[PDB]
Symmetry: C3
Subunit: 240 residues, 3 copies
């Protein structure tokens, strides 16, 4: 309803992408943010990896493989390329596979060129700065197309006065993607700052800020299991 | 004797608190620093988690469950609340369960209110700053009640000139809790700075600084086992 | 041929050093950078650990144990000692075991003394600064013996404008060791910045900069297996 909940395929980077999508089905999510150079896996032939050089046949097969699992290949990233050729090929590929967003970590001088590509392919762009910070992204984005947005990192939720969502300030509306790293059961943490379940408080804040972008989750798949993460996904999804 | 050695229950956050306390028994420790929102586990009913809203009956049961295992619920934290109501409820709960310390990560404007609660409940407070640093805590604490102290993080022990214990400076005496994160066998590390076993050198420094607070240990329970950690606990405990 | 590829024994710090060397054989590497206080393991007696106090007999046995596995004990580190006695003993030990390099994290005032030891034992020194940065190492090293070099950390390869190799600048030639932390399959990462396999691009850059030092790799042995790492080692080694 309000926002989308997807998985960062990096979560399962030790698996093939097809296996990752099978896990995504077991988690009960309908969206993915895929990182490049993951082995695709059957039905793709061995040693074929995710990259913008995939043949038209393999691009069509990749689209089909997402579709039959009920998962949209909504995003690719994080891309941090150094040449215009790479950016061009990356945006063309994203468009060809049918992504609606790309997450990117560019230099400031690359933004002009990247914006032209966003327009050319009707691709939304969520900029991730290098992990002074909040001021630069707002200053850089001011006056640029609405396609040019922000990939916001949700750090360690929640600590008093370090609320990543409350930093949205003047660009709350340009926030297109939220990265949840190391998602835990009910967003529990060694440090907490909420009277209610942290994941409930998190969802409430997203509602209050009318976030309608993509919540892209990552977790440590060696330290957590599908059942544990499904506890958190419950609140992240059933609100929407 | 000199100091206390306890566990951070975050170590086993993938388990229930009762299971965590069973592990704490196998480790041979008599103290715990508990984080909120962990499932309690039997004898508590399913879906009951650690938080300051526990009924008087459940508070009494929690006290009993610690006591029969020979473990004191000495600390709760790290709390980083944003409202006075939350702080009030947290300190009341700590007192009700019989904690002697709480670890906290507040803003500077909250210290006055937090100090009033420390006095009101005779609760000691170990302040953890956001992970300029050493100066602020000393300046903030100067002239405040002896209950207002510091939760010191022991980073990567030991590197020349970056000794966290030697930073104690003028507030060595206000150091109430030391957090050991990612405890390894004999405190071995990829970088070392001692001629003797690092854990032996660490213990010696604690003796030299007359540390008599709580050493609160955390480790990666997926990368280490009880036997390995018991090697380090040996020196941390048998000195005292 | 061009450079050496070795393992950081920290990778397997949960094992004995002998077991670590067995794993190093299974990986197919001929060099090691060993951290101190690891249990040695059979044929050494129980509770004997790696440190500069090993008897001449045990030093000779350690040399033999490396040799029969086809692995050179090329480096020890990272050492971050606080006294001259410790440094002296560490360099003497490195020489006695037949290391050609030591990785170290000293204060600036210790460099003079450390350089004297490097000369005295013909030991190369790779300085690792505390993890303003690039300027200090160049300024500190200027005019010092060619034995005094740099241990460079390869962070998260590869992001545009944050290329650790391109920072080599004026001291490319004093770079003696490159630390690869958390090595992944084909150096894949959640953020990428290359059109080709990241490990291929990495190797190409090392060739272009004529790096001929030691690539010292570490990985998470709980999250990766020998087969996965052998995929990356393939390109790191077969280029040379």
């Amino acid at each position: 309803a309000d926002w989308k909940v997807g998985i960062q395929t990096w979560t399962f980077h030790n698996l093939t992408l097809m296996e990752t999508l099978d896990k995504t089905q077991q988690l009960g999510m309908g969206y993915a943010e895929a990182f490049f150079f993951q082995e695709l896996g059957a039905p793709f032939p061995k040693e074929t990896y995710l990259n913008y050089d995939l043949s038209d046949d393999n691009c069509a097969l990749l689209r089909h493989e997402f579709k039959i699992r009920g998962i949209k290949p909504i995003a690719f990233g994080v891309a941090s390329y150094g040449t215009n050729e790479e950016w061009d090929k990356f945006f063309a590929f994203a468009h060809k596979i049918g992504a609606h967003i790309v997450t990117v970590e560019p230099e400031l001088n690359q933004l002009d060129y990247i914006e032209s590509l966003a327009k050319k392919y009707d691709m939304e762009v969520a900029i991730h700065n290098h992990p002074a910070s909040a001021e630069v992204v707002e200053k850089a984005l001011k006056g640029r197309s609405p396609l040019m947005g922000v990939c916001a990192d949700i750090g360690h939720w929640k600590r008093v006065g370090e609320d990543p969502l409350k930093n949205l300030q003047k660009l709350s509306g340009r926030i297109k993607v939220a990265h949840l790293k190391d998602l835990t059961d009910k967003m529990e943490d060694a440090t907490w700052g909420t009277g209610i379940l942290p994941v409930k408080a998190f969802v409430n804040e997203l509602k209050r800020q009318h976030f309608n972008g993509l919540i892209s989750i990552e977790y440590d798949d060696f330290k957590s299991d599908i059942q544990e993460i499904r506890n958190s996904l419950e609140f992240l999804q059933k609100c929407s």
